[PDB]
């Protein structure tokens, strides 16, 4: 009769019909990833295209049910998902031109090589090579060569291609009732139709800047301390009032500062915690690692793994003649099928990432009862944050004592506490200015407020003001340095890394109160706590059926992202850092340059 009854019928056939195809397509991908043959890839190609051709045909007749005559909110969410025109709005020739442009960027980035001077025969690549230098070299004139050459041969050839990438993808957003491409990516945080929970697309910019204004006092103190320790390594290359050259941060792009731990350890005579030796002495294997991590989730009230998880998953390198891809991943094949692919080793690094992957699986079980189109996290930054907080708890010394890996005769002193936090700070805090600046540069380029003749000029002006990193060699308008990163060249959004960091410390703080934890936030463990698990399970079982604003309120009791819990985690490090820079300068001056 009405238009809602005929819309629910379309959402009743699709759910049962799409699930069948999604299982077969995901079954062919598993076989190739565990058995690499030229015949197994044929099954993936044959099965995958069937699913791809299924969606466009089904979405074609989903546009004939208008959205202005439906009052039931759970139906509008599903209909809006299937009403997305996508890249199908562009013409026949414009779509092809965009498609070949993207494939070119993936090809050039993966096969890029640099040939060293005086040896024109043997050349060096990135995945091995250039990396090794940017992780294990202390020579000033050798790191500079690798930094500049890669951006001179790979980056320069991406300059003309990236210009067309903006203009061909801005018009796609304009036809889709968005004023630019940047607003497309900001639509993942949009909530409409619920009173008291609305979140406009333009409010993401205001909130990100508001939270970042409270991070600078912590960032400057860590920035000044790193600069002082780096003057010892390189005698006459760093100024005490200036910035840090871009080729001395422990990696190629400055994204993470983890490789600087050797030169910036506060107390070098005290070693870190490593339980690899204790595991091999007790004959731990791959099966034991995944058996112990399952017990962690049972204690907090969450369910345990299915029978098919053990019979079907892959937890050890096949060896012999069978080949496979060794990237750790979590699979949701459909129809209640969950597996894990991992080339496990008996180490501490592999013990922690087992909890990270198994945390993903628990999320997938929670919303398996939801409709098919509403089976995901609240937004792009929710799935990763859930897994991260599980690895934080397992890495605590108190947890390791319980599972018998660390002896009860292990005393924790304040010296080792600072060492642990600085290692964490060089990875979490150090990447926040980098993520905020790059996304801001991409956002303002799409709006068009940065002219094509000032792309590089404003790139390094924001670097010196927000990140405080100066270039070693002047870069003119023919360079495309931001395109040298994997995410930028391969069309991936970057703002999910900023929100994931903030979400993961709001979740941790809320869960530690439910467990009645007293003391610094970095020692809190959520094991054997049913209240923490019950609070977390309410968010997990919602899925995409509810606004992320309300889902966040179910755990932390707030409707907006906050940065205060992040500073609480790193508060002890803040006090120690101030006492180090009393006889030193905090901040940087933009007028300095190593080339003048």
């Amino acid at each position: 009769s009405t238009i809602e009854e005929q819309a629910k019928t379309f959402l009743d056939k699709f759910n049962h019909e799409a699930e069948d195809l999604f299982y077969q397509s995901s079954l062919a991908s598993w076989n190739y990833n565990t058995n690499i043959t030229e015949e197994n890839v044929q099954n993936m190609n044959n099965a995958g295209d069937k699913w791809s051709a299924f969606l466009k045909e089904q979405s074609t007749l989903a546009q004939m049910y208008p959205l202005q005559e439906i009052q039931n909110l759970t139906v509008k969410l599903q209909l809006q998902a299937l009403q997305q025109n996508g890249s199908s709005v562009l013409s026949e020739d414009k779509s092809k031109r965009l498609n070949t442009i993207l494939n070119t960027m993936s090809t050039i980035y993966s096969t890029g090589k640099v040939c060293n001077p005086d040896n024109p025969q043997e050349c060096l690549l990135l995945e091995p090579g250039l990396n090794e230098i940017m992780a294990n070299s202390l020579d000033y004139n050798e790191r500079l060569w690798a930094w500049e050459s890669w951006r001179s041969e790979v980056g320069k050839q991406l300059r003309p291609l990236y210009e067309e990438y903006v203009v061909l993808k801005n018009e796609m957003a304009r036809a889709n009732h968005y004023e630019d491409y940047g607003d497309y990516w900001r639509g993942d945080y949009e909530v409409n139709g619920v009173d008291g929970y609305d979140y406009s697309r333009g409010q993401l910019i205001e909130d990100v800047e508001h939270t970042f204004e409270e991070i600078k006092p912590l960032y400057e103190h860590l920035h000044a301390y790193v600069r002082a320790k780096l003057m010892n390594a390189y005698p006459s290359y760093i100024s005490p009032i200036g910035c840090l050259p871009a080729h001395l941060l422990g990696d190629m792009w400055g994204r993470f500062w983890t490789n600087l731990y050797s030169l910036t350890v506060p107390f070098g005579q005290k070693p870190n915690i490593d339980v690899t030796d204790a595991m091999v002495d007790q004959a731990w294997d791959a099966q034991r690692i995944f058996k112990e991590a399952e017990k962690f989730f049972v204690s907090v009230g969450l369910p345990n793994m299915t029978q098919g998880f053990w019979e079907n998953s892959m937890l050890t390198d096949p060896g012999n003649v069978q080949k496979a891809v060794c990237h750790p991943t979590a699979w949701d094949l459909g129809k209640g099928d969950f597996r894990i692919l991992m080339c496990t080793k008996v180490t501490m690094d592999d013990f922690l990432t087992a909890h990270h992957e198994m945390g993903h699986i628990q999320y997938d079980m929670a919303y398996a009862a939801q409709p098919f189109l509403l089976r995901n996290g609240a937004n792009e930054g929710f799935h990763e944050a859930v897994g991260e907080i599980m690895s934080l708890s397992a890495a605590t010394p108190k947890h390791l004592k319980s599972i018998g890996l660390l002896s009860p005769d292990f005393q924790e002193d304040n010296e080792t506490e600072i060492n642990f936090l600085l290692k964490q700070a060089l990875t979490i805090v150090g990447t926040l200015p980098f993520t905020y600046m790059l996304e801001k540069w991409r956002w303002m380029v799409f709006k068009g407020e940065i002219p094509k003749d000032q792309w590089m000029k404003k790139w390094w002006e924001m670097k010196r003001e927000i990140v405080g990193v100066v270039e070693p060699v002047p870069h003119d308008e023919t360079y495309c340095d931001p395109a040298s990163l994997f995410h930028v060249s391969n069309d991936y959004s970057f703002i999910r890394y900023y929100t994931r960091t903030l979400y993961q410390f709001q979740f941790q703080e809320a869960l530690c109160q439910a467990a009645k934890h007293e003391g610094p936030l970095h020692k809190c463990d959520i094991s054997n706590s049913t209240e923490a698990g019950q609070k977390l399970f309410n968010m997990l079982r919602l899925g995409k059926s509810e606004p992320w604003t309300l889902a966040l309120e179910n755990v932390v009791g707030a409707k907006n992202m906050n940065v205060r819990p992040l500073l609480n985690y790193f508060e002890p490090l803040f006090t120690w850092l101030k006492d180090q820079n009393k006889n030193s300068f905090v901040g940087w001056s933009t007028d300095w340059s190593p080339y003048a």
Partner: protein, 190 residues
């Protein structure tokens, strides 16, 4: 008096779909239910309505039926007196004054193939103990359509994709339903 045919219908080679269930008839025989009690752990569901589950062997009925089909593990709770679901609306219905027993068990290694179907849409709920075996397209705004896959026209039969790798809730189950009649009549099964 001869022995009941319960072991010839409780163990066959092929079972039908829910939309087409069989009604093998049991009459003029003596029956022994201890065979279904020795293999009690093989049944994932043993529910009896009207009569007690234990101490039912010494009963006398005026007529006993038997219906058997294959349904997924997520639709097993729908076979009961009083429910809406999807099976209780269009595939198999039980009267509210039903008396009998319901049995089900897992057959993941036998019925794990394509070929089992069930009804999805129809015009109105069916009556108790009704059999529908039509294959005509369905519409949400009129009578009969002549083009499945076309706007407001839908095919009413969905396949039970059966794979041994799937979860427990999506794995095949075989259901046998026994109905007992206890009115004033000559005794047939005792």
């Amino acid at each position: 008096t001869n022995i009941c045919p319960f072991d010839q219908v409780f163990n066959k080679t092929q079972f039908p779909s829910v939309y087409a269930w069989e009604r093998v008839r049991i009459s003029d025989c003596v029956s022994d239910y201890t065979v279904l009690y020795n293999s009690s752990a093989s049944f994932s569901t043993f529910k009896c309505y009207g009569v007690s589950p234990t101490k039912l062997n010494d009963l006398c009925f005026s007529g006993v039926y038997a219906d058997y089909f294959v349904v997924k593990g997520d639709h097993v709770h729908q076979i009961a007196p009083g429910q809406t679901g999807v099976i209780a609306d269009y595939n198999y219905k039980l009267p509210s004054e039903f008396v009998g027993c319901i049995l089900a068990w897992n057959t993941r290694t036998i019925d794990s193939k394509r070929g089992f179907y069930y009804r999805l849409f129809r015009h109105g709920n069916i009556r108790p103990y009704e059999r529908d075996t039509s294959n005509v397209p369905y519409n949400a705004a009129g009578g009969t359509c002549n083009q499945p896959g076309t706007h407001n026209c839908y095919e009413p039969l969905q396949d039970y994709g059966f794979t041994s790798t799937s979860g427990v809730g999506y794995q095949p189950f075989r259901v046998v339903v026994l109905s007992f009649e206890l009115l004033n009549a000559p005794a047939t099964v005792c």
